[PDB]
Amino acid sequence: VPFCGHIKGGMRPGKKVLVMGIVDLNPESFAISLTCGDSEDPPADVAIELKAVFTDRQLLRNSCISGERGEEQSAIPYFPFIPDQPFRVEILCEHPRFRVFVDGHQLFDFYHRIQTLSAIDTIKINGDLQITKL
Secondary structure, X not given: OOEEEEOOOOOOOOOEEEEEEEEOOOOOEEEEXXXXXXXXXXXOOEEEEEEEEOXXXXXXXXXXXXXXXXXXXXXXXXXXXXXXXXXXXXXXXXXXXXXXXXXXXXXXXEEOOOOOHHHOOEEEEEEOEEEEEO
């Protein structure tokens, strides 16, 4: 059962989504996604999915439109999440892309695949973490 939070008005240039939480002691993974609506059984389209996989220390990004996954991106300077450690994730919506910050610094960009930004009105979170803010 994933957490779903509504984002009134959806995304738009300049809007920033903030997620703060604490990684579990022996995490396997977690995901933070912005989606269109919060439907689960017909999964709602995912504009951007941030998936932290601890075994490989990878932070994978992708989208899902009509069930089709896009190109998976993984390039990062370092894996920012540490077991049992607090983290801050901020997703800034810019015209051509989302710019993602972790603990206050830009880590990567994710260019828009789902073009109607206002339809991206849901934040979905699930996995091995405890959400503390937003």
